[PDB]
Design a protein around this ligand. Structure first.
Ligand SMILES: CCCCCCCC/C=C\CCCCCCCC(=O)OC[C@H](COP(=O)(O)OCCN)OC(=O)CCCCCCC/C=C\CCCCCCCC
Ligand SMILES: CCCCCCCC/C=C\CCCCCCCC(=O)OC[C@H](COP(=O)(O)OCCN)OC(=O)CCCCCCC/C=C\CCCCCCCC
Ligand SMILES: CCCCCCCC/C=C\CCCCCCCC(=O)OC[C@H](COP(=O)(O)OCCN)OC(=O)CCCCCCC/C=C\CCCCCCCC
Ligand SMILES: CCCCCCCC/C=C\CCCCCCCC(=O)OC[C@H](COP(=O)(O)OCCN)OC(=O)CCCCCCC/C=C\CCCCCCCC
Ligand SMILES: CCCCCCCC/C=C\CCCCCCCC(=O)OC[C@H](COP(=O)(O)OCCN)OC(=O)CCCCCCC/C=C\CCCCCCCC
Ligand SMILES: CCCCCCCC/C=C\CCCCCCCC(=O)OC[C@H](COP(=O)(O)OCCN)OC(=O)CCCCCCC/C=C\CCCCCCCC
Ligand SMILES: CCCCCCCC/C=C\CCCCCCCC(=O)OC[C@H](COP(=O)(O)OCCN)OC(=O)CCCCCCC/C=C\CCCCCCCC
Ligand SMILES: CCCCCCCC/C=C\CCCCCCCC(=O)OC[C@H](COP(=O)(O)OCCN)OC(=O)CCCCCCC/C=C\CCCCCCCC
Ligand SMILES: CCCCCCCC/C=C\CCCCCCCC(=O)OC[C@H](COP(=O)(O)OCCN)OC(=O)CCCCCCC/C=C\CCCCCCCC
Ligand SMILES: [Cl-]
Ligand SMILES: [Cl-]
Ligand SMILES: [Cl-]
Ligand SMILES: [Cl-]
Ligand SMILES: [Cl-]
Lengths: 312, 312, 312, 312, 312
């Protein structure tokens, strides 16, 4: 009903804590995820103090009404959280214990420079607005921060869930506000990607590369163009999941390099056939023998170079 | 309004029960399902006791207000349940009868190691938080647990719906809590999968395998590559339903083995043609005759080996 | 506020009725549909009786509060209905007239054994729970059951909307309950299916069948395999609408039979070419001439057999 | 709180009006659209009359409570509208001025006989239910019906928004009800359809038709079948937008005619090759020369005939 | 409870301001986006004035009730905003300070004439309706308009967020209303488009163009038609993102020009083969040599012409 008045000028300290219960629905394209967790708050109010001996009880229970509770809000959320009060307890000295359970949709950016083998960090911001009569600051209670053993994400491993103890204080809208950071570190499970994407691509590439042992123009043309069509289908299937970024990624580089290889293979096949038509069956043979060795070595070298560039 | 005070130190026992009415919308990718069911609660409160002879009635009816009702919550739910009170009845000795109908979205993990022929177990957890003056524990009433005869799931058969009678007691947030387990066992209907997926794949594979009776290079190349394209289309159609897992599955193993077979077939066709070009028409014939027998036997043996590995 | 007390032991009779206004969003995969309709209720309460001459009015109007209204619920619904009270009227003898408008999502199974030319029956169940002091039963008022002339379903024709007059009485949760059945019969509009699906399939099949008048192996191989690819694309387009069922359907049988025909055609083309290679140009000619007649007759006969099996 | 009593027997007249603000989300498949608009109501109540000189004011303001407001409902809506009261004003003679802003989802059927170049009319129905003591009728105020200049629909042009002044009075549920019609006429923007659909189809058709200048069987077969596959892909792309109808449309007729042309072209190519095999190189030449002229003229004539049939 | 009465005739001035926090979910097809921001309001009310010395306080705090607050509404929104009051403060002279946080879905049109390299301007309109006793006008407070440093849009860069200081006053529904404009300028990130779309198209075009160095009809036909099929697939992939417009765009022009090039290439290949069949192997050679130079130069010139037309 009214914020507790200070003794002389000290600000009001509120201790926070978040205990995760469920986390799910991590969308790459929308860069959002859903959370379900506990919120704990604690502060000091001497107006609620009582004598345990006289009252005959140790802990008093209060309704959410007829008591002052600070408004804590999330910054990076789509809508306001859906929360219910679980319990409210008051100690004889005046310490208030608050607890609730909530659920919200969090918006956070992601980095896809290493998309198949990337790691991300998720941020949750807590903020509080100072009233005209009292300054409010936030603090972290490390004994009430954690997560359950059953918390799982589809396609991700959860590493740690910690918080930055030092808040950030700044002025917004002629008011002082304190902000807190809760960080959740996850890593992607890349096992399903290998046998579903990487290996069939290599098989199709090798199938395309068998035209350097044939002298039929029509058969080489069929092989190369059909393998190009299959590459296009696979590239469409891959792009239907990865969003667009203003920077270059590993997968896009590999795909572009594969298109360049297909183009060079078409060019080599045309040059072989053209030389063979003009009654020069030695230069075509030399070029074919050279290409047989040149293609796989150049492919391996460019793959090593790309891997060092992106992961070095 | 206030939890009933104990006699000396005994905890408060609450008997629970769940009667399923509707279950639907089982998503493989999101690992969620929707439920609609009855919730029954029963406990002891001696403050509500009355003399039936004096009052002239046997059962008293109370509104949800002006009576203490324990808060029971679900653990693995996306949001709070949408529930309404049906009836509340009080026995002359003080026993309270509670009943409601609710609907919620349950989050539960699944196992896809045997995806076409898998069985799953769904869990629903009930929890209760002890107050500062009374300890609350949960119990199971086997006479109020069941399901209707019209309960159906699209693509699944329902086997049984039971509950674990022994609760789990632990301390969370400086409070003792009791948790209960409700298990629902289902099995997948695999009839639609056979004629829609398994048989056309075998027909396409056999169509690819008819190039070991031909000596035209262009026709073999067309046959093998077109059958590869059709395999890629079918593989895309299959993957558009099965989520990614951090482990290896039956279907993915079969698909990878099919790609390997296509690669080996391409390699055999190229080797046959190359030998025939170099004026050696006996080794090519021998290799073709050997492959004719070798491919189906190796395919059958690898399929048997995979079936024992995954279902043994 | 309290159910009306019986005279000696008679149960309370409630007359129901449903007048449809809008029905839409019929999903084949989810087996759900949306409805918007009127609900009418009528019962007897002698505590509300009045003298028309003394009061000077004929019909009294009451608010939904300060009057006892029975709770009627739907069984096969995803959530509780969204309803508003329109009017409440009381006759001088005590008869209460109730009316409301609601909207709900109904869950009902479907049968796809004759998917292109199937008819379905939709069920809506009304139930009521007896109180500890009065037994409640349901009845049907045939003069308040019907539908508007503007009620339409996208892709379906509406035949009739009737109700079963005899309720079903049974004991559930130590309480007697009465249930009612409202049936809605619809038929599928199959006109759009013919020129969009059935005729192009036949054209593609006939295009595949023109290889029995050619002696070029490469051209036959191209024709058959390309027509197979187009069949696969059409089959994917068809399956993207029809859900999976634990039984065999007409369309799936036809599709499997088409795949079998393509396989046999490939086998015939290979056998023709193999015989022609071994310098036997009479047996190949005989087999080709026989196949020319054999394929269409066998196709027609198997189609007639399937049509009798599924529609006989 | 109570409807105003009549003088002798006259019914109560309510003047309505709708001013559109936003309209969006027009779904072809679901035949629904979303609206956001103003609702204006006006009637006569002499119980609210006052002397302006004595009161010292000209217009009185009332809360939505403690005043009788008629219930007006929409007929063809999925759910009840979400509305808020803007202002309520009372004139000294007793005239009440009502205004609100609402938003709803309207269900209305559509006609696709001329799908690329069709025009539609959208209907919004307002209805009111007579009370047991007063008859209520609806009227139209032409000075409060219109739309903003910024109202736009994605892919449609808005022509006019008028209303039928004569209401429809009928008896429903033993009660007299008045209904009103609000019509919104729109036309489709067909500019994007031409260069995206119509022209590439013609190019692909012409590419298929270049086999009447070649004598290679394999090349003709490749050309015709590949152009058929591309036609199938385009037809799938077109059908993924147009819903199914119980009648024949322009686009479906054109597509079927294109399939028939492809079939006839295949048949002609086979007949040419067969005649050339039997050492008759004059009849094949004559048939080819005749087809060269016959195909485009027949195509143009059938297109003209279809255009007259559907737009005549 | 009542608008503040004017001194003689001056209108009431309300100062507004918007501070953006989050913006997300920009849909090209639906032309909508979601916002989360602060709303600030300020006006003058002398009825709330107080003596600071007598009261002993500097700023008074009021609940949203028991105080007059003007109704401010958004024009181009799908639904009403979801807002909560943060703080309300009153200065000793009577100035009222208002603040809230809200979230809404904004509807605004877009221009796609330069789709890959376009810039858009988003509009947000604030409006207020004058009461029958006071005229209300809106004003802009430049010291409370801005955005956070963490505001990001997926695939867009944010340039500036300003407002037009001059409002628009007009009469609507017999009432004077003031409207304000808030403009947000963004630019598209076109980096991901180049290596994913533009370069593979050029590679496929060049692969098609290698048939002017070959004299095999079948191989040229395969190359051109397969490259056409791949172009069709890419065009479908591009159109699955860009909505339809009543005007011509850059991308659609390029796609149509590519189809025209494929048609002309088919025509050239047919003409070459026809001349070669008629024993004229000099004109075919001349036409091939001319086309080799003509195609790339014409392609470059038409691309330059289109680029000047659309960006000049
Ligand atoms: C070719 C195989 C690649 C082997 C290198 C992988 C080693 C490695 O670090 O992988 C660990 C990584 C951990 O998985 P998460 O992404 O955490 O899930 O993967 C593994 O455990 C091994 C991955 C190997 C892929 C298995 C391929 C299966 C294909 C069928 C049989 C192949 C013949
Ligand atoms: C080839 C046929 C496979 C036969 C082995 C199947 C036996 C078995 O256990 O299947 C039982 C299983 C039960 O179905 P649910 O998955 O519970 O639904 O399936 C069956 O009833 C039989 C399945 C056989 C598939 C029928 C194939 C139809 C194709 C058209 C005709 C074939 C010629
Ligand atoms: C990784 C690089 C992959 C590159 C693309 C795949 C190339 C596979 C080779 C294709 C067959 C052509 C070679 C051939 O016919 O060899 C001839 C040779 C006999 O002729 P000579 O008289 O020795 O001459 O054939 C043979 O019998 C050799 C057997 C080699 C073929 C089998 C193994 C090929 C490699 C497969 C795994 C590649 C990874
Ligand atoms: C080949 C035509 C099939 C003719 C048999 C159809 C007769 C029949 O009973 O159809 C009635 C049924 C009723 O429609 P609903 O499904 O209720 O909508 O369909 C009809 O009215 C006739 C259906 C014929 C399909 C028209 C084909 C159009 C193709 C283009 C021209 C064909 C040359
Ligand atoms: C399972 C394995 C499937 C493997 C791939 C399919 C192979 C089908 C064989 C293709 C035809 C080639 C055989 C052939 O022409 O046989 C020759 C032979 C006559 O020549 P001879 O003088 O005896 O030498 O042809 C015949 O008339 C025999 C008829 C056999 C063909 C029909 C049955 C083939 C098998 C079909 C079911 C497979 C499952
Ligand atoms: C081939 C061109 C067709 C010309 C006839 C169109 C005339 C007509 O009435 O169209 C008006 C109609 C109005 O648009 P709404 O549908 O209201 O949007 O369209 C037009 O303005 C002209 C349409 C012509 C299509 C332009 C084709 C562009 C293709 C690239 C260049 C072509 C060479
Ligand atoms: C239904 C069954 C459809 C089966 C698949 C389609 C087969 C169409 C036949 C293909 C052309 C081959 C026949 C041919 O060339 O006939 C030869 C013959 C002349 O040679 P003779 O000296 O008589 O020997 O050609 C002709 O001029 C006859 C004209 C027949 C072709 C046109 C009609 C074909 C049937 C089309 C409708 C089918 C339904
Ligand atoms: C071919 C490369 C085109 C070079 C011209 C681009 C210059 C330019 O103004 O681009 C700036 C623009 C800024 O990005 P936003 O759209 O704001 O995100 O892009 C750039 O920074 C450079 C774009 C070049 C594309 C890189 C192509 C990568 C392909 C793989 C290697 C190529 C060999
Ligand atoms: C609309 C109808 C479209 C129909 C399908 C497209 C047909 C295009 C023709 C294909 C080339 C075959 C004609 C050819 O080679 O002409 C021969 C002829 C020379 O041989 P003569 O000794 O005169 O005999 O070739 C030429 O040099 C003539 C040039 C004509 C080809 C270019 C124009 C073709 C029409 C394109 C636009 C069609 C719309
Ligand atoms: Cl919040
Ligand atoms: Cl819950
Ligand atoms: Cl209900
Ligand atoms: Cl409504
Ligand atoms: Cl608003």
């Amino acid at each position: 009903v009214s914020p507790p008045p200070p003794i002389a000028d000290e600000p009001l300290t509120v201790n926070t804590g978040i205990y995760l219960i469920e986390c799910y629905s991590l969308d790459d394209k929308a860069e959002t995820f859903k959370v379900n967790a506990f919120l704990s708050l604690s502060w000091k109010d001497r107006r609620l103090a009582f004598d345990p001996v006289r009252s005959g009880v140790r802990v008093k229970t209060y309704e959410p009404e007829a008591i002052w509770i600070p408004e804590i809000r999330f910054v990076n959320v789509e809508n306001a959280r859906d929360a219910d009060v679980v319990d409210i307890s008051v100690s004889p000295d005046g310490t208030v214990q608050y607890l609730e359970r909530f659920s919200a949709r969090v918006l956070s950016p992601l980095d896809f420079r290493r998309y198949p083998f990337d790691s991300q960090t998720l941020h949750i911001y807590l903020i509080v607005r100072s009233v005209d009569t009292r300054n409010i600051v936030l603090a972290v209670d490390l004994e009430k921060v954690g997560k359950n053993d059953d918390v799982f994400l589809t396609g991700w491993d959860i590493e740690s869930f910690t918080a930055v103890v030092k808040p950030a204080n700044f002025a917004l809208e002629d008011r002082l506000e304190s902000k807190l950071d809760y960080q959740l570190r996850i890593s992607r499970q890349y096992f399903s990607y290998i046998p579903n994407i990487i290996l069939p691509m290599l098989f199709i590439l090798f199938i395309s590369w068998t035209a350097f042992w044939s002298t039929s123009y029509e058969a080489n043309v069929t092989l190369v163009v059909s393998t190009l069509i299959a590459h296009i289908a696979f590239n469409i299937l891959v792009e239907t999941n990865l969003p667009k970024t203003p920077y270059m990624t590993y997968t896009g580089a590999i795909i572009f390099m594969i298109y360049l290889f297909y183009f060079v293979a078409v060019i080599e096949v045309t040059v072989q056939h053209y030389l063979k038509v003009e009654s020069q069956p030695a230069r075509a043979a030399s070029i074919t023998r050279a290409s047989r060795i040149a293609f796989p070595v150049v492919f391996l070298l460019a793959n090593i170079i790309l891997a060092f560039l992106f992961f070095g």
